[PDB]
Amino acid sequence: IIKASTGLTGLAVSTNPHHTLSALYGKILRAVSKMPQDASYRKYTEQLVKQRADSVAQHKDITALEKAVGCGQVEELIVQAENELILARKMLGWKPWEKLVQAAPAKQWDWPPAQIM
Amino acid sequence: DKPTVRQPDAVARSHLSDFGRYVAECLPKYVQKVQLTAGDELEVLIAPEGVVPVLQFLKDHHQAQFTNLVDIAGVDVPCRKNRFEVVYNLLSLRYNSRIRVKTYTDELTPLDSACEVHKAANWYEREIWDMYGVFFANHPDLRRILTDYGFEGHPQRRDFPLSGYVELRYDDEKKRVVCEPLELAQEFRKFDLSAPWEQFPNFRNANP
Amino acid sequence: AVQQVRPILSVDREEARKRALNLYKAWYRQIPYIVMDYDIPMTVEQCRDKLREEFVKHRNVTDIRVIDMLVIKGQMELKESVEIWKQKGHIMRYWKESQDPKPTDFLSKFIQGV
Amino acid sequence: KQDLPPPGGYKKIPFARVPPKSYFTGFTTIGTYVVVTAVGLG
Amino acid sequence: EPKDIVEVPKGYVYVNNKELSMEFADITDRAASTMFFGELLRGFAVTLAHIFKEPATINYPFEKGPLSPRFRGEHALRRYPSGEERCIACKLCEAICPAQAITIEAEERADGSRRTTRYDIDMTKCIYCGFCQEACPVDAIVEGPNFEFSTETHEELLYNKEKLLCNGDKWESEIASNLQADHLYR
Amino acid sequence: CRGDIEKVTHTGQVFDKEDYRNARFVNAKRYVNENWGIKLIEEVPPKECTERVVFCDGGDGPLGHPKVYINLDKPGNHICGYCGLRFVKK
Amino acid sequence: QQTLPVAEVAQNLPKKGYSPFGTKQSSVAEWSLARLDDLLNWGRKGSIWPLTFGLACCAVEMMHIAAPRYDMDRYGVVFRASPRQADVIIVAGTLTNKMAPALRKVYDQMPEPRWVISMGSCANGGGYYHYSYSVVRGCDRIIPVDIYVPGCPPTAEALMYGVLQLQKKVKRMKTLQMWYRK
Amino acid sequence: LRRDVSPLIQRIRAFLLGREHNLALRFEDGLADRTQPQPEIPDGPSHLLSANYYCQRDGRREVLPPIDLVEQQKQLAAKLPTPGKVYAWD
Amino acid sequence: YDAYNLVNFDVPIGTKGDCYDRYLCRVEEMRQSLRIIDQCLNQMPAGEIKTDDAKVAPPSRSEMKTSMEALIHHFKLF
Ligand code: SF4
Ligand code: SF4
Ligand code: SF4
Ligand SMILES: [Zn+2]
């Protein structure tokens, strides 16, 4: 039983949301597998993608999956998975797990500016 | 009980503190300092090289969908070495929260345009450029959005005068609206509203 | 006395001078369209003389980021001049019209109080 | 005395959309048009 | 009753959520409303019913619309019942004036009073915000009831001290009645 | 002749005949208030009191000036600095 | 000022009449030109068409004389969008530096006679942005203004009072008498 | 009484409107009185004479500088974290 | 913010996203604001209007013309 409309303009109802979600989570895992293990983003992304893949594997119904995940509808889950895949393929280029490229200068981040010493 | 004192929201404090430590852990390259201000607002103080990779991250992560960008604000603090600061305020509709991402920028040093991340930065980054001279590189078209077409200078810097440099009047010899040096009929009366006694002892040593 | 910064629109002074020459070339090509499409009293030769005067006013600068800032603002004024967004009064703001020429000698400034 | 609501409160302020009364029906309108033009032809 | 395309939650109301009806009675009703201009007939009838309504035109200037005792109009300088001017030149009104219209210059008078030598309000600069009457410790400056003071000439709206004192002399009854009927709110 | 130009105000100001600024009054009236405060506060009599310190309110409570206390030990007339009313002790 | 006349004094005063000139002209040609100017000013004050020039908040009150309570249409006053068909321009809002050649061009394309009403403290004198970098210090430096309506958002009785003052100015216009004395 | 048409025009207007018409203009008997007795404003929580100190209820002086969240864990240590509760906007 | 959690109302949500859905959402906002107005007139407490910190809010005119601290705070805050 598929829904008539998702309630949002411009979003189409997915015919196969389970396979799309599983393929997107597998692509996110294959993207973050190239990252070093000491990076925190890889560990947190692997944890959330593993628990959401367990959620889409335990529940074969659409409405039970949207109730179990709890973050919007399943089309929004597909949108979030594509967004995270884009983010991870940008993380493999940007490499943000290293040190700071520019430290804060002196008297930069203190707000009251003209106080002496 | 104190009914004239605003009570802070603890569920907007603990979640924002855990998320601030989370975003400090996930991006150690760009994030220098996260701080939870009075009023339960979270500030992230990034490097100027990390404007795009931080605002992309908060756009597209599962634990942070800061997909709405409400306003990009420029503050001119001429005391500092990098005088301008640029504040991106982001709203997360999925997790019902707000974040502020602050960076420091000089007028000659360019900044990364967030137009590829959020399309509202197509116009907001123009406005700071019209008012501070903060050049945003890799912008679609960086034009003059609010001031006059023949305006020379950026008005919202603190080194710019309040009444401007020039005025406009109609010349019926040239049959056009001409530009004249400024002469006010009554000058702006600068009031010295400075407090000689300090009133906040908690902000006395907040600078280091 | 030397710092490492992020370049804006140039990486060397010869490249910045080349892009300033691009700006001058495009302004010189856009002069007779400005004289044709605006109802201004200034002619083509006066517009070219004003363009040369505004370039030799900024002849003195040396810094790469400052000259790239000048090139960027000049290209923005040019883009405001190709597409007609400026008016006839905005074009004639380069020539200081409706302004009395202030004297340079000390005697006339002493009589006038300046 | 301060500016306060009366005891028992105010009445229920109407906010819903009530439609105007529609006397006509589409079958009735089509049939009356057919009958009127059939008399008019004669 | 058409079905819902999107299930309406408890705290929300949905517009244009009804399904388009497909039974023949509703199709014939919509067809007759399209062909014979039934909804346009209802709009014409609703329009024609407003000709018979009462006009709300209040016939200016024989009949003037409602005002309030708090109304902000022409600024004016009041006086004591003994006759001395109320304004002690204490300059909180100029300090609080956001457009900085008020200019006060004060000297000691012959009997030793503090009262002004110059009190000018630029009414072309004044924004009629009423901060001066709230910031007045005595009841000297006040928002008068007058708003029919349109001028032919730009300089005539530059109000002097004598013009404000003449406004206080002219409008004293209504200003005093408004201040008597309004002081316990402030 | 017009008598509204050379008439002095209560601030002691008048445009003299050699001034260029009297050309603004050739088509408009010069507004001079005829109700001076000095004569209107000298017209009222002083108030005689027996107690050493008195209070001046200037009229009604919320509609008058802020309350001040005047000490009447010194002989003479003591003037309130707010309203100008004079008190005296017998 | 003048004291408004007491009814004992005012009962001895005769009626003013419609004509500000009076019917006591000496020459028959001067009287005929006076009545022709009276008819011309009656036709001009009987219908002034202001222009839809709403710059800022003041214009929200400008529509409030279009509104059914105040009803500008029974005063000859009806809005026209084109500047050629309009008599009056009502500067209702904040004239800025980018707004100056647009207002001057719109006023210059309007045909003469041209009466201008400055609505609000931003229109005359600059007002609350008088010390701003990009606000013209009143519209009197650009467009010549006949009526100046004082209030920051003028009440709509005060804007219509400015309209009636403009109608009294139009009724006081002397053109043919000046032509006879030119 | 109210300024209104005769009932024939009333029923014509009510038939053309499609609903029972109520008057869109205010009247004197259907509005509040313009003249009215003087009110009294009730006092708040801090108008008590005793046990009111400003420092116990000082709103401006309880504001602290913002806490460095990286250093807060370091000086306090000597279900993924979300910035708020999940709202389903679908 | 400011007793919007003590009032109850519905939120108009469109579907198509065109001008007609936004117009219907605006008129439905005008309809729901009537019941928020009804709740606000139904419950209104009797109390003060300003906060009683006199260093952030101006005092009453009777306290300004009677007491000393209210006159000092009126002077300073104005
Ligand atoms: S606040 Fe009142 S008494 Fe004080 S200077 Fe202004 S008008 Fe005069
Ligand atoms: S009402 Fe406002 S703008 Fe006008 S004089 Fe008073 S404080 Fe100034
Ligand atoms: S005069 Fe006042 S109301 Fe009018 S545009 Fe300016 S601020 Fe707005
Ligand atoms: Zn006193």
- Cα end-to-end span (Å), chain A: 70
- Residues contacting I26, CB < 8 A, separation 6+: I12
In terms of CA atoms, which chain F residue is nearest residue I74?
F66
Query: E28 burial class (0-12, 13-18, 19+ CB within 10 angstroms)?
Result: middle
Q: Are B73 and B42 in contact (CB under 8 A)?
A: no
Q: How many CB atoms neighbour CB A38 within 10 A?
A: 8
Verify whether the Cβ–Cβ distance I53 to H43 is below 8 Å.
Answer: no
B-chain residues within 8 Å CB-CB of G101? 176-177
Q: Are A25 and A53 in contact (CB under 8 A)?
A: yes
- Cα I43 to Cα I66: distance, rounded to the nearest angstrom: 34
Ligand 3, atom 5, lies closest to the CA of G93
Q: Which atom of ligand 3 is nearest to the CA of G153?
A: 3
Q: How many CB atoms neighbour CB C9 within 10 A?
A: 18
- DSSP summary character for residue H79: -
Ligand 1, atom 6, lies closest to the CA of E93
- Residues contacting B208, CB < 8 A, separation 6+: A110
- CB of E67 within 8 Å of any CB in chain A? no
Pick from E83, E85, E67, E99: which is nearest to E142 by CA?
Answer: E85
Of E78, E82, E117, E185, which to mutate for an interface test with F (greatest number of F Cβ within 10 Å)? E82
- Cα I11 to Cα E11: distance, rounded to the nearest angstrom: 7
Verify whether the Cβ–Cβ distance I14 to E15 is below 8 Å.
Answer: yes
Q: Rg for chain C (alpha carbons), in Å?
A: 18
Tell me the CA distances in angstroms from G144 to E154, E159, G41, G78, G141, one per residue in order: 10, 21, 21, 22, 8
Pick from B2, I70, B7, B6: which is nearest to H45 by CA?
Answer: B2
- Residues contacting B204, CB < 8 A, separation 6+: B198
Hey, which of E127, E134, E163 would you mutate to test ligand 2's pocket, going by the most ligand atoms within 8 Å of its Cβ?
A: E127
- Cα E130 to Cα E179: distance, rounded to the nearest angstrom: 13
Tell me the CA distances in angstroms from E154 to B28, B125, E74, one per residue in order: 63, 41, 16
Q: Are B111 and B72 in contact (CB under 8 A)?
A: no
Among the partner residues H17, H18, H39, nearest to D2 by beta-carbon distance:
H39
I-chain residues within 8 Å CB-CB of F61? 62, 65-66
E-chain residues within 8 Å CB-CB of D33? 36
- DSSP summary character for residue G54: B
Supply φ then ψ for residue E167, to 5 degrees. Answer: -65, -35
Q: Where are the beta strands (DSSP E) in chain B?
A: 31-37, 41-46, 68-76, 84-92, 97-105, 111-112, 136-137, 166-171, 176-181
The response to whether residue G170 sits with its C-beta less than 6 Å from ligand 3 reads no
Secondary structure in 3-state letters for chain E: CCCECCCCCCCEEECCCECCCCCHHHHHHHHHHHHCCHHHHHHHHHHHCCCCCCCCCCCCCCCCCCCCCCCCCCEEECECCCCCECCCCCCHHHHHCCCCCEEEEECCCCCCCCCEEEEEEECCCCCCCCHHHHCCCCCCEEECCCCCCCECCHHHHEECHHHHHHHHHHCHHHHHHHHHCCCCCC
- Cα D38 to Cα B141: distance, rounded to the nearest angstrom: 69
I-chain residues within 8 Å CB-CB of B4? 51-53
Q: Which two tokens stand for residue B42?
A: 């979270």
- Cα G165 to Cα G119: distance, rounded to the nearest angstrom: 13
CA distance I55 to chain H (A): 9
Pick from E150, C57, B56, E8: which is nearest to A83 by CA?
Answer: B56
- Cα E142 to Cα E155: distance, rounded to the nearest angstrom: 22
Of I30, I61, I63, I72, which to mutate for an interface test with E (greatest number of E Cβ within 10 Å)? I61
Q: Which two tokens stand for residue F7?
A: 């008439």
In the complex, which subunits touch H with 3 or more CB pairs below 8 angstroms?
A, B, D, E, I
In terms of CA atoms, which chain B residue is nearest residue G132?
B163
Angle at I36 between CA I34 and CA I39, to 5 degrees: 110
- Cα E90 to Cα E100: distance, rounded to the nearest angstrom: 15
Classify A57 in phi/psi space as left (phi over 0), alpha (psi -120 to 50) or beta.
Answer: alpha
Q: What string of DSSP letters covers G39-52?
A: HHHHHHHH---EE-
Verify whether the Cβ–Cβ distance I64 to E16 is below 8 Å.
Answer: no
Could you give the dihedral angle defined by the CA atoms of residues G88, G94, G99 and G100, in that order, rounded to the nearest 10 degrees? 70
- Cα B204 to Cα B197: distance, rounded to the nearest angstrom: 12
- Helix axis angle for A17-32 and A40-58, nearest 10°, is 160
Answer yes or no: is F80 a known binding residue: yes
Pick from H16, D35, D32, H19: which is nearest to E36 by CA?
Answer: D32
Amino acid at E140: A
Experimental method: cryo-EM
- CB of E15 within 8 Å of any CB in chain A? no
Q: Are F59 and E81 in contact (CB under 8 A)?
A: yes
In terms of CA atoms, which chain E residue is nearest residue D22?
E42
The response to whether residue E165 sits with its C-beta less than 6 Å from ligand 1 reads no
G-chain residues within 8 Å CB-CB of C84? none
Tell me the CA distances in angstroms from I63 to F66, H40, I60, one per residue in order: 9, 14, 5
The response to whether residue G121 sits with its C-beta less than 6 Å from ligand 3 reads yes
In terms of CA atoms, which chain I residue is nearest residue F64?
I65
- Helix axis angle for B11-26 and A40-58, nearest 10°, is 120
In terms of CA atoms, which chain D residue is nearest residue H14?
D20
Pick from E169, F28, H60: which is nearest to B200 by CA?
Answer: H60
Beta strand pairing status for B31-37 and H67-68?
antiparallel
Kindly state the helix (H) or strand (E) to which residue G149 belongs, with its residue range.
Answer: strand G147-149
Q: Which two tokens stand for residue H14?
A: 């009510």
Q: Which two tokens stand for residue B121?
A: 């930065």
Verify whether the Cβ–Cβ distance G128 to E73 is below 8 Å.
Answer: no
Q: Where are the alpha helices (DSSP H) in G26-155?
A: 28-46, 58-66, 100-109
d(CA B176, ligand 3 centre) in Å: 26
Q: Is the peptide bond before F62 cis (omega within 30 degrees of 0)?
A: no
Q: How many CB atoms neighbour CB G81 within 10 A?
A: 9
- CB of B180 within 8 Å of any CB in chain C? yes
E-chain residues within 8 Å CB-CB of B185? none
In 3-state terms, what secondary structure has residue C11?
coil
| C-alpha atoms less than 13 angstroms from C-alpha of C46 in its C-beta half-sphere | 10
Q: Which residues pair with E12 in a beta bridge?
A: I11
Tokens 């028959």 — which residue? G28
Of I11, I13, I15, I18, which to mutate for an interface test with A (greatest number of A Cβ within 10 Å)? I15
Q: What string of DSSP letters covers chain F?
A: --TTSS---TT-----TT-GGGGGGSSS-----S--HHHHHHSSPPEEE-SSEEEE--SSTTTSPPPEEEE--SSSPEEPTTT--EEEE-
Q: Rg for chain E (alpha carbons), in Å?
A: 30
Could you give the dihedral angle defined by the CA atoms of residues E33, E37, E43 and E49, in that order, rounded to the nearest 10 degrees? -110
Tell me how many residue pairs between chain D and chain E have CB atoms under 8 A apart: 22
Q: Are G15 and G166 in contact (CB under 8 A)?
A: no
Verify whether the Cβ–Cβ distance H59 to I46 is below 8 Å.
Answer: no
| C-alpha atoms less than 13 angstroms from C-alpha of B161 in its C-beta half-sphere | 14
CA distance D20 to chain I (A): 17
CA distance G106 to chain C (A): 14
Pick from E77, G137, A99, A22: which is nearest to B167 by CA?
Answer: G137
Amino acid at G78: V
- Cα E179 to Cα E62: distance, rounded to the nearest angstrom: 26
Tokens 């809002």 — which residue? G93
Verify whether the Cβ–Cβ distance B19 to H83 is below 8 Å.
Answer: yes
Pick from I61, I54, I60: which is nearest to I77 by CA?
Answer: I54
Q: Are H72 and B17 in contact (CB under 8 A)?
A: yes
Q: Are B88 and B72 in contact (CB under 8 A)?
A: yes
Q: Are G106 and G91 in contact (CB under 8 A)?
A: no
- Cα H72 to Cα B100: distance, rounded to the nearest angstrom: 19
Hey, which of E87, E91, E96 would you mutate to test ligand 1's pocket, going by the most ligand atoms within 8 Å of its Cβ?
A: E87
Supply φ then ψ for residue G32, to 5 degrees. Answer: -65, -40
In the complex, which subunits touch F with 3 or more CB pairs below 8 angstroms?
E, I
- DSSP summary character for residue H57: G
- Cα I77 to Cα B80: distance, rounded to the nearest angstrom: 31
- Cα H32 to Cα E58: distance, rounded to the nearest angstrom: 20
Q: Measured on CA atoms in the order H17, H19, H20, H25, is the torsion positive or negative?
A: negative
Tell me how many residue pairs between chain B and chain C have CB atoms under 8 A apart: 59
Query: Do the chains H and F touch each other, judged by at least 3 C-beta pairs below 8 angstroms?
Result: no
Q: Are C87 and B150 in contact (CB under 8 A)?
A: no
In 3-state terms, what secondary structure has residue G157?
helix
In terms of CA atoms, which chain E residue is nearest residue A4?
E5
Supply φ then ψ for residue I5, to 5 degrees. Answer: -85, -15
Tokens 């007058």 — which residue? E146
In 3-state terms, what secondary structure has residue B31?
strand
Q: Which two tokens stand for residue B8?
A: 């802070």
- Cα G150 to Cα G121: distance, rounded to the nearest angstrom: 7
Q: Which two tokens stand for residue I13?
A: 């949500």
Classify A48 in phi/psi space as left (phi over 0), alpha (psi -120 to 50) or beta.
Answer: alpha
- Residues contacting B170, CB < 8 A, separation 6+: B176, B177, B178, G100, G104, G141, G142, G143
Q: Which two tokens stand for residue E177?
A: 């009645």
CA distance C42 to chain G (A): 19
Verify whether the Cβ–Cβ distance I38 to D12 is below 8 Å.
Answer: yes
- DSSP summary character for residue B204: T
- Cα B204 to Cα B198: distance, rounded to the nearest angstrom: 9
- CB of G146 within 8 Å of any CB in chain E? yes
- Helix axis angle for C13-37 and C64-82, nearest 10°, is 20
- Cα end-to-end span (Å), chain I: 28
Secondary structure in 3-state letters for H8-52: HHHHHHHHHHCCCCCCCCCCCCCCCCCCCCCCCCCCCCCCCCCCC
- Residues contacting F20, CB < 8 A, separation 6+: none
- Cα C98 to Cα C95: distance, rounded to the nearest angstrom: 9
Verify whether the Cβ–Cβ distance D1 to H39 is below 8 Å.
Answer: yes
Q: Which two tokens stand for residue C47?
A: 């517009």
Q: Is the peptide bond before C7 cis (omega within 30 degrees of 0)?
A: no
Query: F50 burial class (0-12, 13-18, 19+ CB within 10 angstroms)?
Result: exposed
Pick from B124, A85, G158, I75: which is nearest to E72 by CA?
Answer: G158
- Residues contacting E58, CB < 8 A, separation 6+: E64, E65, G69, G70, G71
Note the ligand closest to the C-alpha atom of G152: 3
- Residues contacting A19, CB < 8 A, separation 6+: none
Tokens 């005060």 — which residue? G158
- Cα G126 to Cα G134: distance, rounded to the nearest angstrom: 11
Verify whether the Cβ–Cβ distance H88 to A8 is below 8 Å.
Answer: no
- DSSP summary character for residue B82: S
Verify whether the Cβ–Cβ distance G98 to B148 is below 8 Å.
Answer: yes
Among the partner residues I47, I53, I56, nearest to H42 by beta-carbon distance:
I47
d(CA E120, ligand 4 centre) in Å: 25
Verify whether the Cβ–Cβ distance I10 to E17 is below 8 Å.
Answer: no
Could you give the dihedral angle defined by the CA atoms of residues E88, E91, E93 and E94, in that order, rounded to the nearest 10 degrees? 140
Query: Do the chains A and E touch each other, judged by at least 3 C-beta pairs below 8 angstroms?
Result: yes
